[PDB]
Amino acid sequence: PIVQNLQGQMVHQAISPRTLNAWVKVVEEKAFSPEVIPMFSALSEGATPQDLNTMLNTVGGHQAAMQMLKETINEEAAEWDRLHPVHAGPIAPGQMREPRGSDIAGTTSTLQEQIGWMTHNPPIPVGEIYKRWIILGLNKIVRMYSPTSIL
């Protein structure tokens, strides 16, 4: 959960116990269901890496689930590069860079770093991006579980 200071700045307020608690309760009465993917995405409307990470770690802890989520996230990143390219070259001494999705992946970007990308101009939706990624995996997980139930 991120909020905007009174003066004029972007800061996060870490995760919440009531949220994680309820979540845990959900996951419990859910178990990576199609009714938790939406609840998680919403709950992670604009959460940070530590938050989404916390909620992710909070989950049961299935290497299989996490595995797929890992592959998925990696996929999203790839697509990021596929879409918007980037030639890692020179850059002014102090100029920010965009290491493709890999950045939103949290591989080169952290909490503060991500905050900047999201608190920079233009504002990088590193949050919503990651949220979509994580959700992407969860979706893939829920998809795998179900025997392809399409129209």
UniProtKB/Swiss-Prot annotation:
The consequence of L56S is: Loss of infectivity
Query: Where do the record's region annotations for Interaction with human PPIA/CYPA and NUP153 lie?
Result: 57-95
Query: Please, which domain of life does this record's source organism belong to?
Result: Viruses
What does the record say about PTM?
Answer: Phosphorylated possibly by host MAPK1; this phosphorylation is necessary for Pin1-mediated virion uncoating.
Q: What is the effect of changing P34A?
A: Loss of infectivity
Q: Where found, per UniProt?
A: Virion
Result of mutating N57A? Reduces binding to human NUP153 and CPSF6. Reduces infectivity to non-dividing cells. Retains infectivity to dividing cells
Q: What is the effect of changing I37S?
A: Loss of infectivity
- The disulfide bridges present are none
**Residue positions of the PTM Phosphoserine?**
S16
Q: How does it assemble?
A: Homodimer; the homodimer further multimerizes as homohexamers or homopentamers. Interacts with host NUP98. Interacts with host PPIA/CYPA; this interaction stabilizes the capsid. Interacts with host NUP153. Interacts with host PDZD8; this interaction stabilizes the capsid. Interacts with host TRIM5; this interaction destabilizes the capsid. Interacts with host CPSF6. Interacts with host NONO; the interaction is weak.
State the function annotated in the UniProt record: Forms the conical core that encapsulates the genomic RNA-nucleocapsid complex in the virion. Most core are conical, with only 7% tubular. The core is constituted by capsid protein hexamer subunits. The core is disassembled soon after virion entry. The capsid promotes immune invasion by cloaking viral DNA from CGAS detection. Host restriction factors such as TRIM5-alpha or TRIMCyp bind retroviral capsids and cause premature capsid disassembly, leading to blocks in reverse transcription. Capsid restriction by TRIM5 is one of the factors which restricts HIV-1 to the human species.
Q: What is this protein called?
A: Capsid protein p24
Which organism was this protein described from?
Human immunodeficiency virus type 1 group M subtype B (isolate NY5)
Of the intact sequence, the residues represented are 133 to 283 of 500
